[PDB]
């Protein structure tokens, strides 16, 4: 039972002069513009880094819920940010690190066991596993 | 310095019962909903896989434009899709594969040299380099 999900993108002409769009099969991203400027300069807009980050935060959050559930707890709220770094490395760029920042609220859990759980979610979630980048974890745990 | 791009997500409640939302720092994704139903139960909507697929397709298309540039060419059109495999492996799932498909239109390049170029981009773009999954290439080159 292999699951398939698709993303798409379009591009025209030159590297820095060119225009591009990214799409998602669910429609969430119809044909959002993106180009060399939103990736390497600073102009606000999508780029691969940001989508990957969204993907990471999304997968990790689901996973945290999952691991907690197996422990008999139910997150009331889970809020996480995934900051993706695109560093100049050698003759080019590489996505070297992804900083996971998460604020989680869960009824009754002792720090010790919760810490164990988030580590589990952090290292085992599908997206963490497929990424060869350096992944760190920062989190505040309410009550 | 180093380029930083963020992605965000929110999760409330149970794994199977809970709801999630995914965001982007650019805005392109505000608080699109996702869940164990659109991730694992074929229902239409976002999921981590599709976002990774979008990012990869986008990064690779840009890379291809770049390598065509270093060769003295300018793609008039690049249409790529990234099919992401989320496979049930062992005691869970893992993004094991990404099938890249691209329809490219470039003025006057011999099929040989161009072949050497898409291959270059396929393996060299940052996103391909960060992903530890198997990555295949399928393409059609017009003229």
PDB file of C-alpha atoms in Angstrom:
ATOM      1  CA  UNK A   1       0.000   0.000   0.000  1.00  0.00           C
ATOM      2  CA  UNK A   2       2.262   2.791  -1.240  1.00  0.00           C
ATOM      3  CA  UNK A   3       0.804   6.323  -1.065  1.00  0.00           C
ATOM      4  CA  UNK A   4       1.412   8.917  -3.781  1.00  0.00           C
ATOM      5  CA  UNK A   5       1.122  12.689  -3.406  1.00  0.00           C
ATOM      6  CA  UNK A   6       2.246  15.186  -6.074  1.00  0.00           C
ATOM      7  CA  UNK A   7       3.655  18.673  -6.409  1.00  0.00           C
ATOM      8  CA  UNK A   8       4.255  20.522  -9.681  1.00  0.00           C
ATOM      9  CA  UNK A   9       6.180  23.540 -10.938  1.00  0.00           C
ATOM     10  CA  UNK A  10       6.562  25.553 -14.141  1.00  0.00           C
ATOM     11  CA  UNK A  11       9.533  27.626 -15.382  1.00  0.00           C
ATOM     12  CA  UNK A  12      10.389  29.974 -18.269  1.00  0.00           C
ATOM     13  CA  UNK A  13      13.731  31.224 -19.551  1.00  0.00           C
ATOM     14  CA  UNK A  14      16.852  32.598 -17.866  1.00  0.00           C
ATOM     15  CA  UNK A  15      17.984  31.801 -14.307  1.00  0.00           C
ATOM     16  CA  UNK A  16      17.721  35.297 -12.791  1.00  0.00           C
ATOM     17  CA  UNK A  17      15.398  36.788 -15.411  1.00  0.00           C
ATOM     18  CA  UNK A  18      13.019  33.833 -15.309  1.00  0.00           C
ATOM     19  CA  UNK A  19       9.538  33.377 -13.913  1.00  0.00           C
ATOM     20  CA  UNK A  20       8.283  30.244 -12.201  1.00  0.00           C
ATOM     21  CA  UNK A  21       5.179  28.839 -10.500  1.00  0.00           C
ATOM     22  CA  UNK A  22       4.585  26.010  -8.020  1.00  0.00           C
ATOM     23  CA  UNK A  23       1.461  23.910  -7.676  1.00  0.00           C
ATOM     24  CA  UNK A  24       0.137  21.260  -5.370  1.00  0.00           C
ATOM     25  CA  UNK A  25      -2.246  18.445  -6.352  1.00  0.00           C
ATOM     26  CA  UNK A  26      -4.678  19.346  -3.561  1.00  0.00           C
ATOM     27  CA  UNK A  27      -4.963  22.847  -5.009  1.00  0.00           C
ATOM     28  CA  UNK A  28      -3.665  24.489  -1.843  1.00  0.00           C
ATOM     29  CA  UNK A  29      -1.071  25.993  -4.192  1.00  0.00           C
ATOM     30  CA  UNK A  30      -2.663  26.759  -7.540  1.00  0.00           C
ATOM     31  CA  UNK A  31       0.092  28.499  -9.460  1.00  0.00           C
ATOM     32  CA  UNK A  32       1.989  30.605  -6.969  1.00  0.00           C
ATOM     33  CA  UNK A  33       4.801  32.664  -8.437  1.00  0.00           C
ATOM     34  CA  UNK A  34       8.395  32.128  -7.375  1.00  0.00           C
ATOM     35  CA  UNK A  35      11.798  32.775  -8.884  1.00  0.00           C
ATOM     36  CA  UNK A  36      15.481  33.464  -8.291  1.00  0.00           C
ATOM     37  CA  UNK A  37      14.629  36.612  -6.307  1.00  0.00           C
ATOM     38  CA  UNK A  38      12.382  34.963  -3.712  1.00  0.00           C
ATOM     39  CA  UNK A  39      14.899  32.157  -3.267  1.00  0.00           C
ATOM     40  CA  UNK A  40      18.331  33.817  -3.167  1.00  0.00           C
ATOM     41  CA  UNK A  41      17.747  37.548  -2.716  1.00  0.00           C
ATOM     42  CA  UNK A  42      15.077  38.434  -0.182  1.00  0.00           C
ATOM     43  CA  UNK A  43      11.826  39.315  -1.890  1.00  0.00           C
ATOM     44  CA  UNK A  44       8.855  37.995   0.059  1.00  0.00           C
ATOM     45  CA  UNK A  45       7.361  34.871  -1.560  1.00  0.00           C
ATOM     46  CA  UNK A  46       7.592  31.075  -1.769  1.00  0.00           C
ATOM     47  CA  UNK A  47      10.700  29.074  -2.462  1.00  0.00           C
ATOM     48  CA  UNK A  48      11.629  25.417  -1.894  1.00  0.00           C
ATOM     49  CA  UNK A  49      13.048  26.087   1.588  1.00  0.00           C
ATOM     50  CA  UNK A  50       9.775  27.443   2.891  1.00  0.00           C
ATOM     51  CA  UNK A  51       7.640  24.604   1.460  1.00  0.00           C
ATOM     52  CA  UNK A  52      10.012  22.007   2.933  1.00  0.00           C
ATOM     53  CA  UNK A  53       9.801  23.838   6.235  1.00  0.00           C
ATOM     54  CA  UNK A  54       6.004  23.766   6.070  1.00  0.00           C
ATOM     55  CA  UNK A  55       6.226  20.084   5.258  1.00  0.00           C
ATOM     56  CA  UNK A  56       8.513  19.432   8.229  1.00  0.00           C
ATOM     57  CA  UNK A  57       6.531  21.351  10.875  1.00  0.00           C
ATOM     58  CA  UNK A  58       3.407  19.641   9.537  1.00  0.00           C
ATOM     59  CA  UNK A  59       4.811  16.135   9.780  1.00  0.00           C
ATOM     60  CA  UNK A  60       6.494  16.619  13.163  1.00  0.00           C
ATOM     61  CA  UNK A  61       3.345  18.063  14.729  1.00  0.00           C
ATOM     62  CA  UNK A  62       1.257  15.116  13.546  1.00  0.00           C
ATOM     63  CA  UNK A  63       3.911  12.754  14.857  1.00  0.00           C
ATOM     64  CA  UNK A  64       4.074  14.420  18.288  1.00  0.00           C
ATOM     65  CA  UNK A  65       0.345  13.938  18.667  1.00  0.00           C
ATOM     66  CA  UNK A  66       0.775  10.324  17.596  1.00  0.00           C
ATOM     67  CA  UNK A  67       3.546   9.552  20.122  1.00  0.00           C
ATOM     68  CA  UNK A  68       1.660  11.283  22.936  1.00  0.00           C
ATOM     69  CA  UNK A  69      -1.508   9.392  22.072  1.00  0.00           C
ATOM     70  CA  UNK A  70       0.379   6.098  22.421  1.00  0.00           C
ATOM     71  CA  UNK A  71       1.405   7.332  25.880  1.00  0.00           C
ATOM     72  CA  UNK A  72      -2.179   8.087  26.870  1.00  0.00           C
ATOM     73  CA  UNK A  73      -2.225  11.856  26.444  1.00  0.00           C
ATOM     74  CA  UNK A  74      -3.934  14.171  23.965  1.00  0.00           C
ATOM     75  CA  UNK A  75      -2.270  17.450  22.959  1.00  0.00           C
ATOM     76  CA  UNK A  76      -4.741  20.305  23.386  1.00  0.00           C
ATOM     77  CA  UNK A  77      -2.514  22.431  21.200  1.00  0.00           C
ATOM     78  CA  UNK A  78       0.736  21.982  19.262  1.00  0.00           C
ATOM     79  CA  UNK A  79       2.412  24.936  17.560  1.00  0.00           C
ATOM     80  CA  UNK A  80       5.681  24.543  15.717  1.00  0.00           C
ATOM     81  CA  UNK A  81       7.890  26.526  13.351  1.00  0.00           C
ATOM     82  CA  UNK A  82      10.451  25.004  10.997  1.00  0.00           C
ATOM     83  CA  UNK A  83      13.260  27.390  10.032  1.00  0.00           C
ATOM     84  CA  UNK A  84      15.163  26.156   6.977  1.00  0.00           C
ATOM     85  CA  UNK A  85      18.732  27.316   6.298  1.00  0.00           C
ATOM     86  CA  UNK A  86      20.075  27.557   2.756  1.00  0.00           C
ATOM     87  CA  UNK A  87      23.852  28.100   3.175  1.00  0.00           C
ATOM     88  CA  UNK A  88      26.507  28.796   0.589  1.00  0.00           C
ATOM     89  CA  UNK A  89      28.619  25.619   0.732  1.00  0.00           C
ATOM     90  CA  UNK A  90      31.446  24.932  -1.702  1.00  0.00           C
ATOM     91  CA  UNK A  91      30.630  25.839  -5.291  1.00  0.00           C
ATOM     92  CA  UNK A  92      26.982  26.245  -4.364  1.00  0.00           C
ATOM     93  CA  UNK A  93      24.133  26.054  -1.871  1.00  0.00           C
ATOM     94  CA  UNK A  94      22.850  23.368   0.439  1.00  0.00           C
ATOM     95  CA  UNK A  95      19.950  23.042   2.816  1.00  0.00           C
ATOM     96  CA  UNK A  96      22.142  22.406   5.815  1.00  0.00           C
ATOM     97  CA  UNK A  97      19.893  22.794   8.852  1.00  0.00           C
ATOM     98  CA  UNK A  98      16.307  22.967   9.975  1.00  0.00           C
ATOM     99  CA  UNK A  99      15.440  24.411  13.370  1.00  0.00           C
ATOM    100  CA  UNK A 100      12.211  23.075  14.848  1.00  0.00           C
ATOM    101  CA  UNK A 101      10.572  25.425  17.359  1.00  0.00           C
ATOM    102  CA  UNK A 102       7.484  24.127  19.099  1.00  0.00           C
ATOM    103  CA  UNK A 103       5.078  25.254  21.837  1.00  0.00           C
ATOM    104  CA  UNK A 104       3.041  22.325  23.144  1.00  0.00           C
ATOM    105  CA  UNK A 105       0.213  22.247  25.688  1.00  0.00           C
ATOM    106  CA  UNK A 106      -0.734  18.918  27.255  1.00  0.00           C
ATOM    107  CA  UNK A 107      -2.971  18.337  30.345  1.00  0.00           C
ATOM    108  CA  UNK A 108      -0.899  16.219  32.695  1.00  0.00           C
ATOM    109  CA  UNK A 109       2.607  15.152  31.716  1.00  0.00           C
ATOM    110  CA  UNK A 110       5.816  15.245  33.743  1.00  0.00           C
ATOM    111  CA  UNK A 111       8.611  17.042  31.881  1.00  0.00           C
ATOM    112  CA  UNK A 112      10.808  13.921  31.904  1.00  0.00           C
ATOM    113  CA  UNK A 113       8.472  11.626  29.982  1.00  0.00           C
ATOM    114  CA  UNK A 114       7.278  14.394  27.645  1.00  0.00           C
ATOM    115  CA  UNK A 115      10.857  15.252  26.724  1.00  0.00           C
ATOM    116  CA  UNK A 116      11.297  11.628  25.784  1.00  0.00           C
ATOM    117  CA  UNK A 117       8.215  11.746  23.552  1.00  0.00           C
ATOM    118  CA  UNK A 118       9.132  14.895  21.628  1.00  0.00           C
ATOM    119  CA  UNK A 119      12.615  13.488  20.976  1.00  0.00           C
ATOM    120  CA  UNK A 120      10.899  10.385  19.573  1.00  0.00           C
ATOM    121  CA  UNK A 121       8.662  12.495  17.350  1.00  0.00           C
ATOM    122  CA  UNK A 122      11.567  14.730  16.358  1.00  0.00           C
ATOM    123  CA  UNK A 123      13.846  11.904  15.176  1.00  0.00           C
ATOM    124  CA  UNK A 124      11.282   9.445  13.872  1.00  0.00           C
ATOM    125  CA  UNK A 125       8.723  11.496  11.959  1.00  0.00           C
ATOM    126  CA  UNK A 126       8.754  10.590   8.227  1.00  0.00           C
ATOM    127  CA  UNK A 127       9.994  14.001   7.107  1.00  0.00           C
ATOM    128  CA  UNK A 128      12.832  14.192   9.697  1.00  0.00           C
ATOM    129  CA  UNK A 129      13.958  10.782   8.479  1.00  0.00           C
ATOM    130  CA  UNK A 130      14.128  11.674   4.789  1.00  0.00           C
ATOM    131  CA  UNK A 131      16.023  14.912   5.403  1.00  0.00           C
ATOM    132  CA  UNK A 132      19.810  14.674   5.519  1.00  0.00           C
ATOM    133  CA  UNK A 133      20.023  18.122   7.073  1.00  0.00           C
ATOM    134  CA  UNK A 134      20.856  18.974  10.673  1.00  0.00           C
ATOM    135  CA  UNK A 135      17.626  19.159  12.741  1.00  0.00           C
ATOM    136  CA  UNK A 136      17.430  20.864  16.151  1.00  0.00           C
ATOM    137  CA  UNK A 137      14.527  21.070  18.643  1.00  0.00           C
ATOM    138  CA  UNK A 138      13.351  23.978  20.812  1.00  0.00           C
ATOM    139  CA  UNK A 139      10.152  23.665  22.821  1.00  0.00           C
ATOM    140  CA  UNK A 140       8.144  25.068  25.727  1.00  0.00           C
ATOM    141  CA  UNK A 141       5.678  22.690  27.376  1.00  0.00           C
ATOM    142  CA  UNK A 142       2.681  24.261  29.125  1.00  0.00           C
ATOM    143  CA  UNK A 143       1.650  22.474  32.346  1.00  0.00           C
TER     144      UNK A 143
ATOM    145  CA  UNK B   1      24.779  35.753   5.926  1.00  0.00           C
ATOM    146  CA  UNK B   2      22.863  32.475   5.592  1.00  0.00           C
ATOM    147  CA  UNK B   3      19.360  32.384   4.051  1.00  0.00           C
ATOM    148  CA  UNK B   4      16.497  31.485   6.429  1.00  0.00           C
ATOM    149  CA  UNK B   5      12.946  30.608   5.385  1.00  0.00           C
ATOM    150  CA  UNK B   6      10.227  29.388   7.733  1.00  0.00           C
ATOM    151  CA  UNK B   7       7.211  27.132   7.611  1.00  0.00           C
ATOM    152  CA  UNK B   8       4.593  26.698  10.318  1.00  0.00           C
ATOM    153  CA  UNK B   9       1.933  24.278  11.530  1.00  0.00           C
ATOM    154  CA  UNK B  10      -0.748  23.821  14.182  1.00  0.00           C
ATOM    155  CA  UNK B  11      -2.235  20.678  15.685  1.00  0.00           C
ATOM    156  CA  UNK B  12      -5.125  20.233  18.088  1.00  0.00           C
ATOM    157  CA  UNK B  13      -6.103  16.967  19.655  1.00  0.00           C
ATOM    158  CA  UNK B  14      -6.008  13.312  18.674  1.00  0.00           C
ATOM    159  CA  UNK B  15      -4.097  11.675  15.784  1.00  0.00           C
ATOM    160  CA  UNK B  16      -7.080  10.229  13.931  1.00  0.00           C
ATOM    161  CA  UNK B  17      -9.538  12.708  15.474  1.00  0.00           C
ATOM    162  CA  UNK B  18      -7.430  15.871  15.611  1.00  0.00           C
ATOM    163  CA  UNK B  19      -7.178  18.658  13.076  1.00  0.00           C
ATOM    164  CA  UNK B  20      -4.062  20.389  11.772  1.00  0.00           C
ATOM    165  CA  UNK B  21      -3.202  23.562   9.822  1.00  0.00           C
ATOM    166  CA  UNK B  22      -0.072  24.435   7.801  1.00  0.00           C
ATOM    167  CA  UNK B  23       1.383  27.844   7.082  1.00  0.00           C
ATOM    168  CA  UNK B  24       4.120  29.615   5.154  1.00  0.00           C
ATOM    169  CA  UNK B  25       6.064  32.778   6.063  1.00  0.00           C
ATOM    170  CA  UNK B  26       5.441  34.173   2.598  1.00  0.00           C
ATOM    171  CA  UNK B  27       1.701  33.812   3.070  1.00  0.00           C
ATOM    172  CA  UNK B  28       1.109  31.594   0.033  1.00  0.00           C
ATOM    173  CA  UNK B  29      -0.132  29.092   2.643  1.00  0.00           C
ATOM    174  CA  UNK B  30      -2.169  30.724   5.385  1.00  0.00           C
ATOM    175  CA  UNK B  31      -3.749  28.027   7.489  1.00  0.00           C
ATOM    176  CA  UNK B  32      -4.668  25.325   5.009  1.00  0.00           C
ATOM    177  CA  UNK B  33      -6.082  22.314   6.841  1.00  0.00           C
ATOM    178  CA  UNK B  34      -4.502  18.877   6.850  1.00  0.00           C
ATOM    179  CA  UNK B  35      -4.975  15.715   8.824  1.00  0.00           C
ATOM    180  CA  UNK B  36      -4.494  11.999   9.164  1.00  0.00           C
ATOM    181  CA  UNK B  37      -7.342  11.753   6.642  1.00  0.00           C
ATOM    182  CA  UNK B  38      -5.679  13.727   3.822  1.00  0.00           C
ATOM    183  CA  UNK B  39      -2.256  12.326   4.700  1.00  0.00           C
ATOM    184  CA  UNK B  40      -3.109   8.677   5.244  1.00  0.00           C
ATOM    185  CA  UNK B  41      -6.703   8.209   3.976  1.00  0.00           C
ATOM    186  CA  UNK B  42      -6.643   9.513   0.394  1.00  0.00           C
ATOM    187  CA  UNK B  43      -8.863  12.530   1.082  1.00  0.00           C
ATOM    188  CA  UNK B  44      -8.207  15.658  -0.991  1.00  0.00           C
ATOM    189  CA  UNK B  45      -6.167  18.294   0.868  1.00  0.00           C
ATOM    190  CA  UNK B  46      -2.564  19.115   1.804  1.00  0.00           C
ATOM    191  CA  UNK B  47      -0.091  16.786   3.424  1.00  0.00           C
ATOM    192  CA  UNK B  48       3.680  16.868   4.021  1.00  0.00           C
ATOM    193  CA  UNK B  49       4.428  14.746   0.936  1.00  0.00           C
ATOM    194  CA  UNK B  50       2.795  17.101  -1.557  1.00  0.00           C
ATOM    195  CA  UNK B  51       4.599  20.101  -0.073  1.00  0.00           C
ATOM    196  CA  UNK B  52       7.920  18.294  -0.418  1.00  0.00           C
ATOM    197  CA  UNK B  53       6.888  17.365  -3.944  1.00  0.00           C
ATOM    198  CA  UNK B  54       6.159  21.006  -4.745  1.00  0.00           C
ATOM    199  CA  UNK B  55       9.477  22.176  -3.307  1.00  0.00           C
ATOM    200  CA  UNK B  56      11.432  19.550  -5.176  1.00  0.00           C
ATOM    201  CA  UNK B  57       9.726  20.199  -8.499  1.00  0.00           C
ATOM    202  CA  UNK B  58      10.344  23.927  -8.006  1.00  0.00           C
ATOM    203  CA  UNK B  59      14.004  23.596  -7.018  1.00  0.00           C
ATOM    204  CA  UNK B  60      14.767  21.185  -9.813  1.00  0.00           C
ATOM    205  CA  UNK B  61      13.108  23.326 -12.499  1.00  0.00           C
ATOM    206  CA  UNK B  62      15.108  26.334 -11.372  1.00  0.00           C
ATOM    207  CA  UNK B  63      18.258  24.197 -11.348  1.00  0.00           C
ATOM    208  CA  UNK B  64      17.556  22.990 -14.872  1.00  0.00           C
ATOM    209  CA  UNK B  65      17.220  26.550 -16.104  1.00  0.00           C
ATOM    210  CA  UNK B  66      20.546  27.293 -14.455  1.00  0.00           C
ATOM    211  CA  UNK B  67      22.435  24.390 -16.075  1.00  0.00           C
ATOM    212  CA  UNK B  68      20.930  25.271 -19.460  1.00  0.00           C
ATOM    213  CA  UNK B  69      22.340  28.731 -18.827  1.00  0.00           C
ATOM    214  CA  UNK B  70      25.856  27.561 -18.048  1.00  0.00           C
ATOM    215  CA  UNK B  71      25.554  25.741 -21.398  1.00  0.00           C
ATOM    216  CA  UNK B  72      24.390  28.752 -23.401  1.00  0.00           C
ATOM    217  CA  UNK B  73      20.715  27.849 -23.630  1.00  0.00           C
ATOM    218  CA  UNK B  74      17.401  29.214 -22.358  1.00  0.00           C
ATOM    219  CA  UNK B  75      14.445  26.904 -21.764  1.00  0.00           C
ATOM    220  CA  UNK B  76      11.277  28.396 -23.211  1.00  0.00           C
ATOM    221  CA  UNK B  77       9.221  26.049 -21.044  1.00  0.00           C
ATOM    222  CA  UNK B  78       9.761  23.589 -18.162  1.00  0.00           C
ATOM    223  CA  UNK B  79       6.927  21.517 -16.721  1.00  0.00           C
ATOM    224  CA  UNK B  80       7.895  19.155 -13.975  1.00  0.00           C
ATOM    225  CA  UNK B  81       5.976  16.980 -11.553  1.00  0.00           C
ATOM    226  CA  UNK B  82       7.291  15.290  -8.475  1.00  0.00           C
ATOM    227  CA  UNK B  83       5.462  12.147  -7.429  1.00  0.00           C
ATOM    228  CA  UNK B  84       6.254  11.440  -3.743  1.00  0.00           C
ATOM    229  CA  UNK B  85       6.091   7.885  -2.429  1.00  0.00           C
ATOM    230  CA  UNK B  86       5.107   7.474   1.189  1.00  0.00           C
ATOM    231  CA  UNK B  87       5.674   3.741   1.741  1.00  0.00           C
ATOM    232  CA  UNK B  88       4.582   1.513   4.604  1.00  0.00           C
ATOM    233  CA  UNK B  89       8.030   0.224   5.577  1.00  0.00           C
ATOM    234  CA  UNK B  90       8.679  -1.738   8.782  1.00  0.00           C
ATOM    235  CA  UNK B  91       6.688  -0.342  11.722  1.00  0.00           C
ATOM    236  CA  UNK B  92       5.608   2.821   9.948  1.00  0.00           C
ATOM    237  CA  UNK B  93       5.994   4.996   6.869  1.00  0.00           C
ATOM    238  CA  UNK B  94       8.957   6.620   5.145  1.00  0.00           C
ATOM    239  CA  UNK B  95       9.279   8.858   2.081  1.00  0.00           C
ATOM    240  CA  UNK B  96      11.188   6.293   0.042  1.00  0.00           C
ATOM    241  CA  UNK B  97      10.859   7.762  -3.392  1.00  0.00           C
ATOM    242  CA  UNK B  98      10.360  10.786  -5.578  1.00  0.00           C
ATOM    243  CA  UNK B  99       9.666  10.294  -9.287  1.00  0.00           C
ATOM    244  CA  UNK B 100      10.534  13.444 -11.225  1.00  0.00           C
ATOM    245  CA  UNK B 101       8.718  13.940 -14.544  1.00  0.00           C
ATOM    246  CA  UNK B 102       9.459  16.912 -16.779  1.00  0.00           C
ATOM    247  CA  UNK B 103       8.414  18.175 -20.212  1.00  0.00           C
ATOM    248  CA  UNK B 104      11.051  20.620 -21.419  1.00  0.00           C
ATOM    249  CA  UNK B 105      11.135  22.899 -24.481  1.00  0.00           C
ATOM    250  CA  UNK B 106      14.519  24.339 -25.457  1.00  0.00           C
ATOM    251  CA  UNK B 107      15.356  26.061 -28.809  1.00  0.00           C
ATOM    252  CA  UNK B 108      18.194  24.114 -30.433  1.00  0.00           C
ATOM    253  CA  UNK B 109      20.028  21.666 -28.173  1.00  0.00           C
ATOM    254  CA  UNK B 110      21.145  18.232 -29.313  1.00  0.00           C
ATOM    255  CA  UNK B 111      19.396  15.456 -27.355  1.00  0.00           C
ATOM    256  CA  UNK B 112      22.754  14.211 -26.079  1.00  0.00           C
ATOM    257  CA  UNK B 113      24.156  17.316 -24.396  1.00  0.00           C
ATOM    258  CA  UNK B 114      20.738  18.243 -23.031  1.00  0.00           C
ATOM    259  CA  UNK B 115      20.487  14.765 -21.510  1.00  0.00           C
ATOM    260  CA  UNK B 116      23.784  15.416 -19.725  1.00  0.00           C
ATOM    261  CA  UNK B 117      22.244  18.670 -18.426  1.00  0.00           C
ATOM    262  CA  UNK B 118      18.890  17.517 -16.963  1.00  0.00           C
ATOM    263  CA  UNK B 119      20.839  14.731 -15.271  1.00  0.00           C
ATOM    264  CA  UNK B 120      23.174  17.357 -13.801  1.00  0.00           C
ATOM    265  CA  UNK B 121      20.243  19.362 -12.408  1.00  0.00           C
ATOM    266  CA  UNK B 122      18.327  16.306 -11.239  1.00  0.00           C
ATOM    267  CA  UNK B 123      21.175  15.181  -8.964  1.00  0.00           C
ATOM    268  CA  UNK B 124      22.595  18.587  -8.126  1.00  0.00           C
ATOM    269  CA  UNK B 125      19.712  20.821  -7.091  1.00  0.00           C
ATOM    270  CA  UNK B 126      19.742  21.465  -3.301  1.00  0.00           C
ATOM    271  CA  UNK B 127      16.424  19.746  -2.699  1.00  0.00           C
ATOM    272  CA  UNK B 128      17.534  16.595  -4.480  1.00  0.00           C
ATOM    273  CA  UNK B 129      20.730  16.695  -2.382  1.00  0.00           C
ATOM    274  CA  UNK B 130      18.891  17.075   0.934  1.00  0.00           C
ATOM    275  CA  UNK B 131      16.501  14.182   0.283  1.00  0.00           C
ATOM    276  CA  UNK B 132      17.691  10.696   1.199  1.00  0.00           C
ATOM    277  CA  UNK B 133      15.015   9.063  -0.998  1.00  0.00           C
ATOM    278  CA  UNK B 134      15.469   7.313  -4.337  1.00  0.00           C
ATOM    279  CA  UNK B 135      15.063   9.855  -7.126  1.00  0.00           C
ATOM    280  CA  UNK B 136      14.188   8.970 -10.698  1.00  0.00           C
ATOM    281  CA  UNK B 137      14.039  11.161 -13.798  1.00  0.00           C
ATOM    282  CA  UNK B 138      11.561  10.960 -16.693  1.00  0.00           C
ATOM    283  CA  UNK B 139      11.552  13.591 -19.395  1.00  0.00           C
ATOM    284  CA  UNK B 140      10.492  14.602 -22.885  1.00  0.00           C
ATOM    285  CA  UNK B 141      12.560  17.225 -24.692  1.00  0.00           C
ATOM    286  CA  UNK B 142      10.900  19.152 -27.528  1.00  0.00           C
ATOM    287  CA  UNK B 143      13.111  20.296 -30.430  1.00  0.00           C
TER     288      UNK B 143
END
